[PDB]
Design an enzyme around this catalytic site. Structure first.
Site, short mmCIF file in Angstrom:
data_model
loop_
_atom_site.label_atom_id
_atom_site.label_comp_id
_atom_site.label_asym_id
_atom_site.label_seq_id
_atom_site.Cartn_x
_atom_site.Cartn_y
_atom_site.Cartn_z
N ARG A 1 32.10 4.44 39.27
CA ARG A 1 32.56 3.73 38.09
C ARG A 1 33.73 4.46 37.45
O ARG A 1 33.63 5.65 37.14
CB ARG A 1 31.42 3.59 37.08
CG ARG A 1 31.68 2.59 35.98
CD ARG A 1 32.09 3.28 34.70
NE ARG A 1 32.71 2.34 33.79
CZ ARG A 1 32.04 1.49 33.02
NH1 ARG A 1 30.72 1.46 33.02
NH2 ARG A 1 32.71 0.65 32.24
N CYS B 1 38.51 -0.78 33.88
CA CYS B 1 37.32 -0.25 34.53
C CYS B 1 37.14 -0.86 35.92
O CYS B 1 37.38 -2.05 36.13
CB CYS B 1 36.07 -0.52 33.69
SG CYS B 1 35.94 0.53 32.25
N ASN C 1 33.90 -4.44 30.69
CA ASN C 1 34.30 -5.37 29.64
C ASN C 1 34.63 -6.74 30.21
O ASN C 1 35.27 -6.86 31.27
CB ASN C 1 35.51 -4.82 28.87
CG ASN C 1 35.36 -4.99 27.37
OD1 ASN C 1 34.26 -5.21 26.86
ND2 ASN C 1 36.47 -4.87 26.66
C1 WSR Z 1 36.92 -0.39 31.06
C2 WSR Z 1 36.18 -1.46 30.37
O1 WSR Z 1 35.93 -2.52 30.91
C3 WSR Z 1 35.73 -1.16 28.98
C4 WSR Z 1 34.22 -1.24 28.80
C5 WSR Z 1 33.68 -0.52 27.55
C6 WSR Z 1 34.47 -0.96 26.32
C7 WSR Z 1 32.17 -0.76 27.43
C8 WSR Z 1 31.43 -0.60 28.79
C9 WSR Z 1 29.98 -0.21 28.46
C10 WSR Z 1 29.90 -0.33 26.94
C11 WSR Z 1 28.73 0.31 26.20
C12 WSR Z 1 27.39 -0.18 26.72
C13 WSR Z 1 26.23 0.41 25.93
C14 WSR Z 1 26.36 0.08 24.45
C15 WSR Z 1 26.14 -1.42 24.20
C16 WSR Z 1 26.20 -1.74 22.72
O2 WSR Z 1 26.00 -3.19 22.48
S1 WSR Z 1 25.80 -3.70 20.99
O3 WSR Z 1 24.95 -2.72 20.35
O4 WSR Z 1 25.17 -5.00 21.12
O5 WSR Z 1 27.12 -3.77 20.41
C17 WSR Z 1 27.54 -1.34 22.15
C18 WSR Z 1 27.78 0.16 22.38
C19 WSR Z 1 27.69 0.60 23.85
C20 WSR Z 1 27.72 2.14 23.87
C21 WSR Z 1 28.87 0.02 24.69
C22 WSR Z 1 30.26 0.42 24.17
C23 WSR Z 1 31.40 -0.22 24.97
C24 WSR Z 1 31.31 0.11 26.46
C25 WSR Z 1 31.57 1.60 26.72
#
Ligand code: WSR
Ligand code: WSR
Ligand code: WSR
Ligand code: WSR
Lengths: 315, 316, 316, 316
Positions: free
Chosen positions: C17, C1, C81
């Site tokens: 993004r 990302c 991430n």
């Molecule tokens: C390219 C990268 O760096 C990958 C990032 C990716 C895996 C992340 C980036 C944003 C995340 C979402 C943010 C919103 C929520 C947050 C939740 O937190 S929790 O409930 O405490 O676990 C998890 C779900 C989610 C939808 C994230 C998922 C992972 C991301 C898309």
């Protein structure tokens, strides 16, 4: 500058450094015997019967200013440039062992027999910078190693960091943490023969040796020398005799040598590897060659009266 | 392997090579005096009074087999491995000066005094590869230089290519033209202190020396060694005396040295710089050091009976 | 990302993004209106009249989980991430503004209008990780930017670090301090045509454009992507209108796209830029295209009842 | 510029190219129907019933001068810049098929049905460069592909070279054999997750995906673009539908896109990927997007009167 440490089959110490600069400091092989009387600048503690010490450095005010030195028990230490990152206090702090920066190498080699001891004693040490007549203050970090391992001492604004040197190597800026992270970019290079492969229909084979090592930077900057000498030191086959290990030491440091005309400094003059120094604990001998004379000269501990009381400088 | 050549202010030859292999052939400083009688394999002619020759090589069937050699007039030549690209004929060619591949260094050093002379007579030279049954054929290209310039002799299946070597440097595969094209990738590398600059709002400054050199490869493959040693030879400041020039030559070759452990060969053994040889026309002296001993020895032509008729060897 | 920020000559915000992953989670365009009621998990204090917010994310328990989002005043925030370096506390702290990690983007966009306001109140914010028992822990770092500058929020074991992102660019591991130090290796590259030069007698000229750019890494690792997109953002010529600036945003991010087959993750699946999102404060509009549909699609805030009270998830 | 070819499980042709330049020539989608009459400049023969042709190009003197084109049988061809190496005669040669350089793409597409046929005919073809007094002479090489393989046509001073393109990819200077040799420098890169290893007592792991790819250059020079797109074309997983393969074709070419500000050419202007065109033999359809509109426009051969006798062009 570059510092290297490695061991042999029997746990002996092999330790050395390149001195890269634009002019000589008139340094010399320096022997400080056990009977030499030394008063620490800030009253730092010591041992009742100090250790014999040999190395390379200069004498100022009848004090041995060691660029790097070792003792009779296999402990060695070198000082390397760290400006823009090194930060010392100029006032002693009570309750701690206050050591001047210039006397840190001599203090370590005189009073300690192992990296283990140095690591614990450093837990209550204040590195104090006292300006020496006529010379701008040195901003250094130190590379200490014995027969088993090495550590890095980086005194910065936010305190003193002592790192476990898992690659047994050190250069200059930036921080040691940056260099260990930077190594991960090159984690796929290999000293093996490049395995034949294909990209689509195109068959790829190496011309010969070295293709698997492609990716290692070749410039003489500090981060790139770190990667190059860490790879060289980690892939050198272990040796078992004095001559072969000394040969390993100078060849490993030679892998990051600075040749005339390669890189200019801020002054406008070329930085070059003026001398390469080395120490062996198997025979308690210091080794050295220079840019103008690659013949390795030896300086044993067993041919100097280590019970004498005056500093000895061998031209 | 790597060949390097440069000159001083007085026009003297400075020539040398690294030998990077996994084992030694017993090679040795070898002196071929003027009185030694040599019979060319396919009858190529030469000087009635040959030049004195010193170099590094072996003696096979009473013939001096040079890895690299020079003569008393400042002309030197080195043989470097070129398999997969080098290709020769196996039978001589009538009307041309047919020279065997193993005798090419000796034949050049004895009969020619300049690179202009070698380049001229190469237009009628046939390099024959004599087939020895119980041994693979030596597949080399050559690096020839004097006080003024150097050339690269690359005999391939499509003819003999004689290149003008403007970087005064040679390694191994692939072809010389590839290496010259590859240097253009690194034309922006500089030995100057990296000038402070900005990327957007971020000020960029160098930690110190060497950042302008960033981009130069550091591996010991043949193409990377060509770039690194061509950079070092071109940027090394010109020197005035014999000691400084001999120290320049060995330090230049030391930039592409092969250290134990860096790279394995096809048969599993590591490739190392077993020795480094040098030559200076200012004193007609050969130099050499080894992997096990970095002290540079000297072997002047003046210390040998160059009017004698028997090959002289000094072992290690 | 990768996250990218820049500005036009009128002080507007352009925030972009890349989302590089191996599969989608069902994210859509997600609109959170001003009249939508939201209770912060740990009772963090916000505005009385919240800001209108649009972005990309999912809906979990009727809570807008934003991958990235912006508000009607030009402030945008993206989560990327950061595992291996990101470390949070699991319980709130007395006297501080405790914010859950998943609601940090929504909390930032609804209550603040600039990065100055965000950087000020962040000196008293505690990010808490509420671990769902059956799920793994979300370990991110955030890229926050407006029309003037950007900042990077990296919450680690030794506290919260807020960096002034002078390159207006963020990728993944390791810490932001490493990436800025790393850029000093490449400070000598240039978007200018390489000037002809000489190595000894060898004259070196560029084949064409791009040779001054030699040195920039080309792989899709996290530190290499940071270097490449920081170079592209810093050297992109300034644009005056909106269509050219949205084009600049998607080309800059496109310079570090992850193509199918380029790199496998841990599970043996290939990592790809599944979508590219963007925001413009000149028109308060969100833009997005996907790996399977390169056409950019716009979602204007003026197309939605920003005074309603229900989350609006836009499909297709 | 960059050429790219690949296929699917059914053997269809997928062919495309990027156009990198500082300005446009007004080129458009250009349909050449079978009934169109063409008198070759130097009397080069051809089929009685010519193939239908479509591509991107300009019309000069009622002649279709394609930048790249493809016929109804799946054979495509593109022309890429090659100054400093391209060298043509300026007079026809008796006994051969004398084809002018500007009519080479149309001649190949109208008269041949496979790469195999073009290879056999090129043995008796003379590439004649007919120059006008105003404009400078075009110095190009050509990338020809079909559903099976591709070839490279490089006419130089020492003759015409037809290389089998094993990587199915072409860019600009230098010669094609340089690029194939250069790829060997990178033979150790991998799209696999980098495996944890150790240097001495230090344990090295990858931050995430892409560390195995470290080594690939990221600049927009012609040699670096060759390595990066050959890598990307070689590791893309095969697809088995039209939409997935058009996506692959444009994503692969996007890996070497020239973004505004990356590199200036000789006259001080930035070079950019102005348009990206593609072709699919499964549907006989040409595709195209531009720097300003990433949406992929389609132009199917079945939407034009292929029996008509006049050139059809699509404005802008
Ligand atoms: C390219 C990268 O760096 C990958 C990032 C990716 C895996 C992340 C980036 C944003 C995340 C979402 C943010 C919103 C929520 C947050 C939740 O937190 S929790 O409930 O405490 O676990 C998890 C779900 C989610 C939808 C994230 C998922 C992972 C991301 C898309
Ligand atoms: C390896 C490097 O790049 C470091 C630079 C190089 C010029 C250093 C290496 C060792 C230094 C000397 C060490 C002994 C004393 C220390 C004094 O430090 S001070 O008290 O802070 O002034 C300064 C003088 C001297 C001789 C150092 C000079 C610089 C070094 C040779
Ligand atoms: C670093 C490299 O490029 C490696 C070069 C090395 C392997 C070569 C260089 C000189 C060779 C020797 C030359 C003299 C003779 C020639 C014989 O071949 S023949 O013509 O068939 O007789 C083989 C033996 C020997 C000693 C060569 C061996 C290989 C080289 C040392
Ligand atoms: C990225 C690249 O390599 C593209 C280079 C670019 C400048 C070339 C590629 C195709 C060329 C056109 C081809 C059609 C005709 C051919 C005419 O030839 S001439 O009459 O002999 O001079 C010249 C005009 C034109 C339109 C070419 C112009 C240059 C190209 C667009």
């Amino acid at each position: 500058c570059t510092g290297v440490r490695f061991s042999d089959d029997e746990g002996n110490t092999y330790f050395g450094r390149n001195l890269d600069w634009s002019f000589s400091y008139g340094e010399t092989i320096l022997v400080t015997p056990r009977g030499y009387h030394y008063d620490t600048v800030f009253g730092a503690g010591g041992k009742a019967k100090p250790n014999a010490v040999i190395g390379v450095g200069v004498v100022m005010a009848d004090r041995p200013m060691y660029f790097d030195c070792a003792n009779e028990h296999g402990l060695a230490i070198a000082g390397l440039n760290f400006p823009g990152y090194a930060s010392f206090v100029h006032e002693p702090v009570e309750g701690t062992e206050n050591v001047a920066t210039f006397e840190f190498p001599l203090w370590v080699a005189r009073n300690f027999d192992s990296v283990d001891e140095v690591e614990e004693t450093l837990r209550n040490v204040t590195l104090v910078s006292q300006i020496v007549p006529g010379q701008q203050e040195s901003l250094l970090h130190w590379f200490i190693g014995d027969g088993k391992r090495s550590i890095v001492v980086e005194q910065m604004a936010d305190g003193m960091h002592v790192h476990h040197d898992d690659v047994d190597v050190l250069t200059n800026q930036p921080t040691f943490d940056f260099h260990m992270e930077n190594l991960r970019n090159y984690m796929c290079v290999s000293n093996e023969m490049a395995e034949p492969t294909s990209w689509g229909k195109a068959s790829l084979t190496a011309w010969g040796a070295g293709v698997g090592m492609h990716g290692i930077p070749g410039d003489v900057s500090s981060p790139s020398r770190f990667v190059r000498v860490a790879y060289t030191n980690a892939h050198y086959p272990q040796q078992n005799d004095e001559a072969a290990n000394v040969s390993r030491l100078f060849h490993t440091l030679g892998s990051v040598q600075m040749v005339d005309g390669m890189a200019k400094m801020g002054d406008g003059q070329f930085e070059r590897t003026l001398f390469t120094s080395g120490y062996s604990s198997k025979t308690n001998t210091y080794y050295m060659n220079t840019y103008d004379d690659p013949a390795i000269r030896s300086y044993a501990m067993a041919d100097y009266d280590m019970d004498s009381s005056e500093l000895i400088s061998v031209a």
